[PDB]
Paper text:
To gain insights into the binding affinity of the acivicin moiety, we assessed the electron-density maps after soaking the GGT crystals in acivicin solution for various soaking times and trapping its binding processes by flash-cooling. A similar vague electron density was also observed in the substrate-free E. coli GGT structure. The differences are discussed in terms of the recognition of the α-­amino and α-carboxy groups in preference to the dihydro­isoxazole ring, as observed in time-lapse soaking crystal structures of B. subtilis GGT with acivicin.
Author numbering:
A (entry chain A): 37 to 396
B (entry chain B): 403 to 586
Write the structure that this text describes.
Amino acid sequence: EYKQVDVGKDGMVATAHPLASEIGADVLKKGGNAIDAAVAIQFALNVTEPMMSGIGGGGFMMVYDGKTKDTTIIDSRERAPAGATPDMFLDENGKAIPFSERVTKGTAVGVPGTLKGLEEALDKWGTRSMKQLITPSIKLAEKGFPIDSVLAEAISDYQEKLSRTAAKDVFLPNGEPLKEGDTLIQKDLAKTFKLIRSKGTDAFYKGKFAKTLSDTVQDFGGSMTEKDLENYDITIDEPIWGDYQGYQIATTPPPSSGGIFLLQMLKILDHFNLSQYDVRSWEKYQLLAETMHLSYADRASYAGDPEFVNVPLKGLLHPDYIKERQQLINLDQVNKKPKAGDPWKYQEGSANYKQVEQPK
Amino acid sequence: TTHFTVADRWGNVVSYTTTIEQLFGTGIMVPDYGVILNNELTDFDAIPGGANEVQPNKRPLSSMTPTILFKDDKPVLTVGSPGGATIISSVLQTILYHIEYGMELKAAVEEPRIYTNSMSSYRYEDGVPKDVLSKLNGMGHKFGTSPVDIGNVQSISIDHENGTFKGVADSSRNGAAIGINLKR
């Protein structure tokens, strides 16, 4: 069996799938570093947890370099194609296409970054080639593995959308979902990984795969071209740092909302000395809920890709701004109309965008 | 989305969140190549004009929050999670329970979480007391009639004085933590 807590003297791996953790650990055991292991783990999870991540998507990889002592982020978040438009998720009446329908459309497909990110990570810090690191996943894709509970639940839940594409041949063989613990074989994906191993990431971003990917997006109504794939590159992002209870915290900046609002909620909540309240007390949950409403409101108003929009980071994290927000919170009463604050009173400039409420 | 983390014997530390958006993304597979395509662009606002509107070549806002915490200029803890908009709250709660409440790491990860991004959207995990939910709803919150799992935190802590690592996987999935003890 496998453990959900472990200790070690010479390293550690934690992932959502035991086969991926085993592959990451083997890289470390064989003299690889944490970046080599992470790259191998991503390929492994692409195969063994296929609903959740892979070369069809994008991610944020934070790396502390033990040599240089620097922390940087490989940002492989997907890009909208050149043919994307502001109103592309609206119907003819200018109203939002229902989310459940929106999700299955070719217009939803971002230019994938994950593979470019892995290539970058290896360029920067790798001591094992992508050929070495992708090999365990080639074997898992080609030869198969028996499906875990979280996977078998996914296939059942999502049968409708899988049935309308090529995915049906993998996950719904003979027209029905695979069960626990049936064997999942991914021959085409294995072939793709082999192409990447032999040709490098051009097997993905150029040539016949790139043509097939873009034609398929277009078949499903999206605008992605081979040029969009050829143009794609990752971004190296500088972490945003905060102080909390004697710790320095390195977290992710825009185009992620996570770092700003993690720091903002910690700064708001730090004021309340939560440990004075029992960990299961209504007081604690109240303070958490009220803080979330305020921060999530600011997120909806002010966060986006910083290559494009002026995110008021200075204002949102200004200690006097934090003070204003905390003052809006009571134990005894709930804000029924929580709204974004005005971080612009605590920094220079103004938004190059409007305040537009999203439906639901 | 999924989150994982690795630390090695040379002090390198990785905290990596990665996704195709929905479970199975769009559900579209590149024919003859087996690649499942993300629906990531639905993370943009459907109605344009604001910070997170769609533009060509723009990236949709993410809630992914891979994080590394430091003490005395060394990395001591990694945190991250999947779960869409709930991600920021799962990372927040893990740090609160481990640091503010001083709970051991596995316990901090397993502590029942809540999430709520507006007056009309609430989630809570099994273990949030029924009388707490009643008290909160009585003030105007809108927690529902059944719990849901929230997030999936993988985390590594590092003890630099003892020279040891500890890894934790969240019980919300079947993850595994594996320590390295080299024979050499």
